[PDB]
Design a protein around this ligand. Structure first.
Ligand SMILES: *CC(=O)NCC1CCN(S(=O)(=O)c2ccc(Br)cc2)CC1
Ligand SMILES: *CC(=O)NCC1CCN(S(=O)(=O)c2ccc(Br)cc2)CC1
Ligand SMILES: [Cl-]
Ligand SMILES: [Cl-]
Ligand SMILES: [Mg+2]
Ligand SMILES: [Mg+2]
Ligand SMILES: [Mg+2]
Ligand SMILES: [Mg+2]
Ligand SMILES: [Mg+2]
Ligand SMILES: [Mg+2]
Ligand SMILES: [Mg+2]
Lengths: 10, 236, 236, 10
């Protein structure tokens, strides 16, 4: 499983 | 071509339309044109730029990962390991991905980084530089890889230094930067100890100051803090 | 690029890779190249061609519908200052959609319809011609629209004539054709009575012969029958 | 609220 980075928002 | 002849306000409006239509390649092109008008971007406009290019490269990264997995399974001996096609097509997708990263890095260097007035925007663009070097590093092999990794680290570190001097610990940009730099440590730089230490320190210091954070940033900051927690669980 | 010199088998393999990577524009380009090698397509290959172009035009249609809705809402409000940007961007997406449809129709005319050996494949391609004229009709205006509608109807009618003489009522191609022609009647030709009549007859005659369906095509045929039922419920 | 046409399969 890959690490999570910052998502797209708003 | 067309972008240069459109007014800035029209380019922004079209970027928003493209977003609604889920046409992210178009959205990115409109935002590149808007950047090229030479005015600073607002927060809203930085978000448009980010969403557009992140969606484009996101699709490419996903495709690359699929193809690379097939390629590696093929190359496992015992498997019929039949043909140049997967390598060739993986290379095609890789080249396109590198092209997009180069475009973003070019805009950052030519227009966005030098011309930012305030700490928030400076950190945002340096974070973005780190991110796009990190995406190049994901597909890099050999000597160029070491240079790309160094470029990512340098950008992230400069952003970190500014953010610690200038911004509260629960600021969403500071948080998103720290999250991504921790991912860099873990996934790119073979540094799980630093990834975990940074994520843990970031989480704790953000939570300690959360009571001071403005309500307009609460949703975004709490989302990043959850991802820090989730990564920490995954990494330990 | 230079697909003329590429091995047909390599083009098919790359189409399958592109499908796995969810790279549908690439997938379509590979299948166009394969068609242009000048051999008939197999069932699997017809499916690849269909999935690729349907995904591409599907995205365009969805985007066009979003933009057309915004355009009309803007115009209705009638503000002295809004509307030109969305019109221009809707036109841009429309032009791209028309280009893809023209490509598909060109391949059908230049390579696929004439050169099909059997009734099943001939009906499949004539259905596809009907579908891509129907997608052109969705965005057509004025006199051009009447011609496009006539072209769609002619293709569908020829397909229907062959399918009724040559194929069982539960054949997935015959069913998919009837479903799409009924949609044409309802949504394009403003002929709800014909849409309902065709959908009802198709459903009933398929159900009457359901006990003869091979398990190989049972899934696909029953899915189309469900969509006929769903449309009938929507239309009545 | 549009009519359904034949989907992609396989
Ligand atoms: C004010 C401003 O500059 N806003 C635009 C930025 C867009 C995305 N970044 S981020 O990549 O740091 C980030 C932070 C938090 C989340 Br939930 C997602 C992305 C922040 C500001
Ligand atoms: C054997 C053969 O020619 N197969 C390929 C075709 C691709 C899709 N068509 S269809 O568009 O008529 C269709 C029918 C049923 C469904 Br659930 C979806 C699409 C059928 C055969
Ligand atoms: Cl290729
Ligand atoms: Cl436009
Ligand atoms: Mg101007
Ligand atoms: Mg073998
Ligand atoms: Mg390479
Ligand atoms: Mg040969
Ligand atoms: Mg008004
Ligand atoms: Mg037009
Ligand atoms: Mg027959």
């Amino acid at each position: 499983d890959r690490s999570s980075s910052a998502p797209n928002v708003h | 071509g067309a972008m240069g002849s459109m007014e800035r306000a029209s380019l922004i409006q079209k970027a928003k339309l493209a977003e609604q239509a889920e046409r992210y390649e178009d959205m990115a092109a409109f935002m590149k044109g808007a950047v090229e008008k030479g005015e600073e971007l607002s927060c809203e406009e930085r978000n448009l730029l980010s969403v557009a290019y992140k969606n484009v490269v996101g699709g490419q990264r996903a495709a690359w990962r699929v193809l690379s997995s097939i390629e590696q399974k093929s190359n496992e001996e015992g498997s019929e390991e039949k043909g140049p096609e997967v390598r060739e097509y993986r290379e095609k997708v890789e080249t396109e991905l590198q092209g997009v990263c180069d475009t973003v890095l070019g805009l950052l260097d030519s227009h966005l980084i030098k011309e930012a007035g305030d700490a928030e925007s400076r950190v945002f663009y340096l974070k973005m530089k780190g991110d796009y070097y990190r995406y190049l590093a994901e597909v890099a092999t050999g000597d160029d890889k070491k240079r790309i990794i160094d470029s990512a680290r340098s950008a992230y570190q400069e952003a970190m230094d500014i953010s610690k001097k200038e911004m509260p610990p629960t600021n969403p940009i500071r948080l998103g930067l720290a999250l991504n730099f921790s991912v860099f440590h873990y996934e790119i730089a073979n540094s799980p100890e630093e990834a975990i230490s940074l994520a843990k320190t970031t989480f704790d210091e953000a939570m300690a100051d959360l009571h001071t954070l403005s309500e307009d940033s609460y949703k975004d900051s709490t989302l990043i803090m959850q991802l820090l927690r989730d990564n920490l669980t995954l990494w330990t």
